[PDB]
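ok so heres the complex, eight chains, lmk if somethin looks off
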Amino acid sequence: DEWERTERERLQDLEERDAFAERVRQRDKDRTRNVLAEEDRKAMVPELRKKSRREYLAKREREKLEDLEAELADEEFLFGDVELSRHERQELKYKRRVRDLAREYRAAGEQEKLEATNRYHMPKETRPGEEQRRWEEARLGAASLKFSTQAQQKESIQAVRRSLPVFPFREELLAAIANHQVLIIEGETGSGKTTQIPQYLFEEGYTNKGMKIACTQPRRVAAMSVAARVAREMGVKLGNEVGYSIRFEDCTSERTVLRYMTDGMLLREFLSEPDLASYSVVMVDEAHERTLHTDILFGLIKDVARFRPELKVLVASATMDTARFSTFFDDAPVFRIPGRRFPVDIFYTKAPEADYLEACVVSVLQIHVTQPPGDILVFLTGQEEIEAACEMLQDRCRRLGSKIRELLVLPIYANLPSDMQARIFQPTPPGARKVVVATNIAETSLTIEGIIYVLDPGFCKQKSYNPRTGMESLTVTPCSKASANQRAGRAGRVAAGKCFRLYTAWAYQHELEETTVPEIQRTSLGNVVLLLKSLGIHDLMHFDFLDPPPYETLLLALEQLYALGALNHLGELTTSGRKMAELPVDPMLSKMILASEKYSCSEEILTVAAMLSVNNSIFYRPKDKVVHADNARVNFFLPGGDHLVLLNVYTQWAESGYSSQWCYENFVQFRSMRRARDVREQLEGLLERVEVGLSSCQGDYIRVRKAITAGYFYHTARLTRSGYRTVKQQQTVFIHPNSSLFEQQPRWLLYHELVLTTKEFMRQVLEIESSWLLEVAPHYYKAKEL
Amino acid sequence: LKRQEAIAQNRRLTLEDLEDSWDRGIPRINTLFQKDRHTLAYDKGWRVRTDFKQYQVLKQNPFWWTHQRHDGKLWNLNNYRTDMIQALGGVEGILEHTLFKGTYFPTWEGLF
Amino acid sequence: ADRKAREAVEMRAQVERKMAQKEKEKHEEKLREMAQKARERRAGDGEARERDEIRHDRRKERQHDRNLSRAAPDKRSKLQRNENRDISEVIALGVPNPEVQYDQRLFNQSKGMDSGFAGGEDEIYNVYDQAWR
Amino acid sequence: DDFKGRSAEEVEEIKAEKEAKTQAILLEMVGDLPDADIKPPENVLFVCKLNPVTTDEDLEIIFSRFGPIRSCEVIRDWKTGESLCYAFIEFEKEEDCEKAFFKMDNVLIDDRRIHVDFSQSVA
Amino acid sequence: DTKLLILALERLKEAYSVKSRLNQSQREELGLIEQAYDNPHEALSRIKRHLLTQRAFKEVGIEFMDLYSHLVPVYDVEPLEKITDAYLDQYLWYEADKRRLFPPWIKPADTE
Amino acid sequence: TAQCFLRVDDESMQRFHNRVRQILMASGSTTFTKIVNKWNTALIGLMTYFREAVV
Amino acid sequence: DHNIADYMTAKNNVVINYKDMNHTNSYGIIRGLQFASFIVQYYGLVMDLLVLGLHR
RNA sequence: AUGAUGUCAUACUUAUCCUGUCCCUUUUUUUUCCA
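and the predicted structre for the whole thing:
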């Protein structure tokens, strides 16, 4: 098939790849010049002992570090249980006390240091969250007036195991798929379809012949959860035979039979081994999730399904998506699991409503006041709405005093500080109610036990990308039937629930569209379009889609890539073009990274990329500390723009030694910072392959802004006296309020986002020269237009 | 003590532990919980500083010795008003002395 | 006098420093004793198999650690410690329980940062603090 | 004083003397070596970056070039035997150790640019 | 520093609590307080510049407060320097009390 | 073991008296309710400081 | 810090002005500065030391 | 004898304005000799 043309290309891909890397190391052995009595010798032998000694000091203390850690790492899982004897027992006493002695005989020296810099030193003329416990002993000091059972665990595991909606459905489903290679398996959450199924497969030996069993998930954290769960079931260590591989974190060994991953992870395994010949089975979970990676894997694995009939295709999901599922997949049989723990009474408003956020408020008010025990889940659209919500709720709490009971309002969304995410996971303080205000982040993968009420105002904030304008707008959107059903289904998992729809049966049954548009239509796909072009294709049109994009969307993609220089004038791959597809993240960024090669601003452009990878959550902007926050922000504000702002911010953080309290003092989201650092480090781990020399701009931000241009020339606007307006389409934009240039308002502007919130917007913007534009893109940007 | 036990039994100190002693104490226990504890843990030397304001402002403070945000609020004379009315006679005895009945307002609860 | 006092401060400082230094080293010699007798006191039906497990686990651990540091300079420092600080991670990992907090009907019942005594003003009506009825 | 007021050089040199003394006493603390820091024989090179396919025989071959060998010891992962991709190699002369070193540093054998440094072993 | 400067400026507005007919000079001082309340970093830049380079200041005016039994001097400083000193006041007292400069017998203390 | 007998100091009585004196003196330009607001402020400031030395 | 010590000490030495008389402070302290609380209590610490002695 | 150049404040014009403005949902990309 086109599959075979692909793997043709891809095996030749691996051949040419290995040979290329080998050629390059030969090149470097060429470039690199191997230029390699009595008292001279007896001189430097003391100096070779100098270095032997000192490198040995670090080396010996390093080996001490190794076995040091190893003693306790070893006594973690052997001693505290078993009936063990004299030898290793005595040596546990030994290694216990002995690593104590090491820590102690070093803590002595550090004690000397700090005690002897405690002291008084005449000045010399030369030209963690406890500001509310350091103000709670101010008061108590101002107010002082003095003058076997592991087998038992296994029993419990199996005993719960047996009660799944799949444990009695065990055998016949096994025999069924033994018949059919492609078996669609419809079942809702809690059935265990993600957990019990791969076990069944393994105990049935599909791992024999050394084979593996893949489980893909759309979310890292969900994969980690799943893997922990099934490794506990299987009674082994997570990582050796049951393992998960996600970006930045391998948790597998060559004992791994049961390997969990992401959809992009599996696509990238096709960047390793087109056949998956070590995998006997791929089980794709929750495919309904509608990601670009799901919709690529569908095609690729369907190819493999026709090409590899000894291979096994399992695709499980939550909802009615089996119609199109089977139909695209040659109408595979559909095994139905019935799985739904407890019931929901789903209510509708009497009528349609005008003020649905307030309606949220007054609803939970009534519910809390009247209802029996039980936790509440409420949806909003997102951040600003949601804090306004807790505003209103806690204000009415203030007014209603002891007339009511303790209402643990907790907001939760994606960018809010991670301690504040975790805070909802604590068991509720007896007698009080806990209400979680949430976004559709709480649709999926977050498991909050205790929630017995669920309120849906029936909406969502969906992105919508029109390509005719290049505009993606995160705007309000009445949420689908599948949405409302699943938002409701979030409930019940331990008891009878309720689901209050802020809209009637009429609007529900009548004007409810089934599914969110399968992602590939609505999204922008520059990295992804390019990825499929460089992954076994030329004709990008008759390709085996599930849902193709509009030819419009594809045409825009092609023009994007050509103009940027990834495409020839006929649409195939340049050296610049390939290098970017292999490079992780999109091209515009990729073009900028290549531009660092020309501009000798390698490190700085690297760190910038690392920032734009995650930005959306950098700076925490609380209402209760607005001014000090704006301040720890306004500190770094550099001349040139937000990108070099980010550059210095990261620079200063790592400067502090990757300090968390640093960002805590300086109002920065530690999550964003450290994941960005990781993406830059693995970028550097790509950097050798993409042939980048590690260079500094030596403080010359001109190179920086110019590499930014050489990447993002497309993303530019100019001054018009009727506002800031595009360079090309002359459609009218506005600057984000929180821009480091927001009041600077430059004449020649570069951005990184293009949205239209309440008005058209652009994010991560910088001031440029129109001259660099004739430096870089005289074929795309001509002078007369500037 | 209750704070220790709230750490040991790890409970949350609830309103029932502190509604009894809610304006008692010297700072005042209801200063523990005010809005701006966070930026008032940074105001040190406030007592000397209000003493010395007398050389900077041309007016004379009668509460130089204290601070309402920091020391609490240390007197409550809300019943003075109530007993003043009952001793003068009650609102009816009190408004037989005034022009109230010549306004033809129907009752005195609304007066503003 | 300022020069003289600077000198005497520094001389007294380094005297006392050196005294406590020597005392620290004596402490350390006692701990040298502790270590020697520690291994001495150490040296002299599950343990044999748990012990093949000892060297099995530890030695494949050295395998993975060497090989980490060899594929990437410290891929041990890029894998194992970096495994264990982020929060969603830990919650999925079932690690348990990884200060006083109390009810929120307590907080923010008063807002303001200035004493109500208006800074020495008198002529304003602030006697009682509740509107009459 | 005067263990500080001599230079900056010998100052930090004394502190490196220390760092040694402390790391030694530390490593004996956690208990590896029987006798404290006895000077290592000048006649063994520790040669790392090695190949699991180069053996005692071949390494003793190539390091037979510069001096009379007393042994070639690639320490073995015990219950599987796989070469540890490093080694100790044992000469008769200081001159033999040195002459092997100063030509064999960072050379490519079996397509790997191995490293030679002298033995740090007190083992 | 923004906590220390917020405390400074609150202390300074307490003078003009009533917002009387004040004058030109008090109108101008209130303007300075508000603009440094809006842009708290132009302020702190200005402050630390003053503290670093200035050693010749404007002149201060004097007058007396008559307490009928003796008089009290009252000094009038210029609003720019009033702000730099308010900040330095807060800062020195915070640091001095954290480092424990003043032993416990120095007694207008904040504890009682 | 002992008793403390308290009294208001002489100079504190005199300072209260001078404070009332300047109320009355600067009141030909105040309205009845401001004269009484200043009286109320001064008298609370005395009674709540001394509190049983006044008795 | 010698910078802050110098700012404080040079700020006490200003020209003091009443209706039409002017003079220059050179000896004592202007108590109407805002750090003058700090200066008075530090000086008073030094004089506590002269009264009690360092041992007591 | 009137040049443009201007970071010049002042003066001046249009019965020219005082009513035409504001904060993102979800989440994913494989990696390489250590020394």
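quick notes: The first helix of chain G runs from residue 2 to 11. thats all i got rn
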